[PDB]
Amino acid sequence: QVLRGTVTDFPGFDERADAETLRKAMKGLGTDEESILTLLTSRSNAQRQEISAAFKTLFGRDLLDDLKSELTGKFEKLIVALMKPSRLYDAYELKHALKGAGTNEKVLTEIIASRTPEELRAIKQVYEEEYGSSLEDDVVGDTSGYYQRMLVVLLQANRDPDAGIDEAQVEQDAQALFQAGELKWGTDEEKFITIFGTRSVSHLRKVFDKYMTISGFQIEETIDRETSGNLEQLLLAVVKSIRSIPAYLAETLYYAMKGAGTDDHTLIRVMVSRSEIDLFNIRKEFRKNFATSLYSMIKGDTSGDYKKALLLLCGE
Template sequence: MASKGTRGTVRDHPGFNANEDAEALRKAMKGLGTDEGSITKLLTARSNSERLKIAAAFKNLFGRDLVDDLKSELTGKFEKLILALMMPCLLYDVHELRHALKGAGTCETVLIEILASRTCAELQRIKQAYKEEHGTELEDCITSDTSGFFQRMLVVLVQAKRDPDGRVDEGRVEQDAQDLYKAGEDKWGTDEEKFITILGTRSRTHLRKVFDQYMTISGFQIEESIDRETSGHLEKLLLAIVKCVRSVPAYFADSLYRAMKGAGTCDDTLIRIVVSRSEIDLADIKQEYRKNFGKSLYDAIKNDTSGDYRETLLLLCGGDEYV
């Protein structure tokens, strides 16, 4: 995905030459030892579409598979990060969803993060690519691996039938806010179906107005009510949807903060967000991170990671300044 006109930190490289880059990578991996620094500097300075062209040139020039060579030369988190960069953007989402559903147990965090944050157009492409890659429907895999209202909310999101962004039904704003209030705060028990229908089908612009109206009616932010009225994976999913409605970059900034706070770092989350948003809105995510947590994302990564893995993440992050 080219990043021109977007808020990504990774852009097309001026004077890009796939053959020269392929030769540089071959040199970095040939013989005794591997020049990890050269691999990192080159791949982080190329867009995803350029990396794919380098892989094609590598095959033409040397009759070798670039990804296979990288796998054999690199290890650990650094290897995982570099291989993520070499995957087409769309297929990276598909790969992460497949791994979340078909690994040992279901990784609900990945399902929540991807399905709550992607646009309807992106979700449609993900579903099509998932079917092409794995010969099965994404929705079928979700229904076989999840249950209850959590499953129903995921299925609604995968339908990708949310109203087009910008569409606001002024006459329905008040009604939706009242319905959410009656479904939660105003009754004994919770009418989860009402939350699922409204949060899963209305446009983000419409929902922002609903949330404002909800605050007027109830005296609570919608997040506070979800926190009180639901629990477990459903609560996390509904909160993720609300956060993405308010601001997708702020949602990812929050996810990155949580991935790095406390004992240990959730490297899978760190890799997935930095790689998948590097050509879309990582510059905005950096701004939200600084605004909401009082320090830069760059410094957080620097303090929480090490080695070639850290260097690669920092280069993808695009420095410590605003972009």
């Protein structure tokens, strides 16, 4: 239960040297994809920011645009992602997943459901520092209904800290969920939102087992029978995140890679955002559930420099 990333500190790091290797590979005709991809995918995000800074004092060039110009396709979208400061990545995805005429509820749901209260607190702060408004305000602007109310509950980053399992409360919650869905003519979505969004992780795990005991349906089965659309997805993401975030994301990527069209935004976002958190566990949880290493579905749906990067980002 010690979650592991795949990208770690590069020993003998030299921001200026690393920076020269980039301008040297970036400068002149086209670009030298291998040197960039193999350089970045091996340097921790922190070192990537130090390099990106050395590059600017050295040449007076903003390293990033020197990449969002010499590059294009899906390799650019990836390296650009890798370059995004860890602290700003989620808030960035949310901002652009929110400056949509349409909306990738997948991004909001994915991020706001799998991130801890501590992470959510940081995300909210940086979002209001990088852009002009509150993350909550912008969310309430592109969403409506229960899908919005669940996201707003989550965004409060208030979830109870797990501190002891009270049986009576576990049965009351399991019983309340039961009475608000399966046994209700219609649905009481508000009871689901409150339970799933504020109770502690440990408590909720105890509630999901008891719910299966008293009803015969996994909470996910009931969620499928009782809810639909955006709310269904979020509710499913919260429960799966409560059970295991590594298993959840490991699941997310499969349905992006095994779809009616490969969603490259998810394969990239999930692997980049988790590259330093638990992308190793997302791999372990992959070889066990979906039955296939993350290493392979990469080596079987992508091409060019895009692959070698992803493969090096996963870690054999």
